[PDB]
């Protein structure tokens, strides 16, 4: 599929921003769930509003027309719904509509044809019935991996573009369940904690790259899939992160060779939860949340903007295989033109005696509890 | 009042040091409470001891004589005691004396005339009656906003120069109490918490400055007062802080223009508490705590130094207006000439076998609980 | 003793790495306990494996032969076992052997002659009887200061090179027990906590060095010993740490002069606990944990490597004197040649759809609880 390279780079792009944001934290995300939600969103959007997005999903528009893109997506999504039988792989892109919404059909058609979208009809005014209906469609799409994707749901909520992906794949070679031997994880420069560490001896597709100063191990799944890992060298984690490319990835994919090794790889369950707004904004994708937000391509009546862009992604690893899930969530409610200035982020301020123009106090609010 | 510019800059000076000290914390202080305490203190002090201070309250002594300064203070303090009636504004500079103190009258006169000072007579030897008496005079001066300004009170405590300011002012336009809508505060690059966010739509004195890369909103009070706020731009908080000046402030004060806006500004109650010694020291104000400390200008019998320089400042904001308070505290007890070296800050050390001069151990104490 | 300079520098070397690793933490270690363990270990080791070590204990091998080194150690250790009577000083270097171990006698002899080593015979297969036996020999060697040196003990544990040092020395001048006056410790740039601060006025060997921008105080012990302290100047702690040398230390040792001072020095009990592997590795000492690990010089049957290099060092200070203790621990179990790659440190990884080579997920595991 012709679009894959861009996705890869967008995954690297997007990963980078998340680590650039917090070194001291766990990271896991679905580049696909995200980009899809947004390409699938890009349809209701037009002009320079829309352009930002797809140059920010790492696409070169002075090269590929819009048509050739959305085809690629369509193809890929399809591919994933029909794997080998031993490999469980689903994806669903449901679109929940407020009851009483005057739509455009050009949009309506397009997301149904190209993005297998499912439209449902919910009362956002009954917000805690709306939360249920939506957390229903996720907590089954993800087959019960992700449930609480919507914790706060606006009543003024127009619609909600929702996306999910479910993965469950068993290993090429399961691990010894009795050989799962609790061990030390050297967490930071400084600290150490106990994990259920799985150990196995055998012949492994693994190599060191001078370029990435890392060990690159591949673990083929039962079916048509592969997890790739990277043991950075001592103090090379950031150098590694720095240096990842699609083509480097491709090179590794094809390396068929194996060799003897003793491997220790831990049993774990992790989550990444995100409001991406900030993050994405950094990728150039700012207009679509704002009051210059072009959502004409969805409906006439009312003028909207994209409220919160929320991703959540869990992962879980054990001897037999992997459980992995991604899940987008784009809320939109009525845009209001009248310009908006909210001090919902840390800020400064004085207080001045009018007559003599002298500061009584000054300060910076950085948090109101407890400070 | 001719001295205001210097105060402003001292407020910026002093603010800067507090943020330079801890980004990751809340900030609120009264530039006035502080400077006053210290100008009012500068009176008992002489020569190069004294000079440090006022060059450190941001005054140019090769320009303004001492006379012209203390007049300015006197005037200002006065101004503040008699505002518009709708605007509550008090200040008091009480000076608590140990029973049995031989004073100088030149000093005694000066702080009574110029700084409306009130002198009281307390037994520092009965320390927890001394704590009460002083926390009495504050927790009413601040009308019950600040109470625990003295948590640890030396028995060898000679006197205590105390300062307070109380502010209570209602808005130009109160906010909708039913429109106070709990919302998300994006606290750090990383984290998010729920505040009571006040929202109102109307015509606001607000502008963006290229220079400060911030939004500058003014909210006039009932009476003769104005609070100024600053929404830094994305990642401009430090650039903003960097760039603030008196004249820039003045420029904004006069901008009368208003315009349409939707504003979200949160309901909060914050405190800043400080031992300033360190901080101030950085402003050049070091001699006055030390054994070169010139407190002759107060009394003959005994030779003193300034023990702890303590500021505390609370603030509180809601729909109708603002409650804000500042409070200094300068403790002095008997200086002791005999040079002093205290390892009360983190330090290094070895242990050596005398005969062979070999290190048995080495270390750095950085804290004795738990380490 | 000719080797002392190197130890000093190794102590500085090693200290530096520990602070370079975590500013925000307490530091205390025995340069001697460590180096001894390792010189005493170096005996079972040969060639380039062995060389790394002693160039990393700060020795110049293109200058001093191996003979001249191990003599020095022998001499020093001896010296320490027979001090002045008023000064309690012991050291023991016990070596615990698995029952059924075919040894080399060249090694056996050498560590008995040169390093007063004591060999014992333990069943590592009964691991929690092994833990006892070893924590026995430490928690008496250290006369009950250090007890839990072995919290996790491998069953496949071959042997354990163990080292200890016990110190108890009373002051030149005890402090006033009734003059121990709780006070403020300014811990960080930012925070403050209460310590039992000992205070005394008298004549103290103390000086300021332009070079180290610190106060350098010596406190002679009852007997043949001296503790040295360093009050860095404001913000000079790192400059101080930077600049320490053996010769500078020597210069200070000899300064006999005293003078009047008021000193405040706190009552405390601190510990430093370490797995040194990382740290030491940085000093060039990497081969000996690895699969190129040359432990032929110990036994024939089986091929081993050094599993965990563990130091723990407590300290305690009060009016009368000091309790101080160091304790090494080098575990070795069967090396396994077959190359080893363990993701027991934070790492990256993708998951790829084989057919289209597109990233489903990506991530970085940095900790599996809670993330």
Swiss-Prot record, chains A, B, C:
Its main location: secreted. One of its GO terms (molecular function) is serine-type endopeptidase inhibitor activity. It comes from the Eukaryota. One of its GO terms (biological process) is acute-phase response. Changing residue 133 to E: In L-Frankfurt. The modification S-cysteinyl cysteine is found at residue 209. It is linked to Alpha-1-antitrypsin deficiency: A disorder whose most common manifestation is emphysema, which becomes evident by the third to fourth decade. A less common manifestation of the deficiency is liver disease, which occurs in children and adults, and may result in cirrhosis and liver failure. Environmental factors, particularly cigarette smoking, greatly increase the risk of emphysema at an earlier age. Inhibitor of serine proteases. Its primary target is elastase, but it also has a moderate affinity for plasmin and thrombin. Irreversibly inhibits trypsin, chymotrypsin and plasminogen activator. The aberrant form inhibits insulin-induced NO synthesis in platelets, decreases coagulation time and has proteolytic activity against insulin and plasmin. This is Alpha-1-antitrypsin. It comes from Homo sapiens (Human).
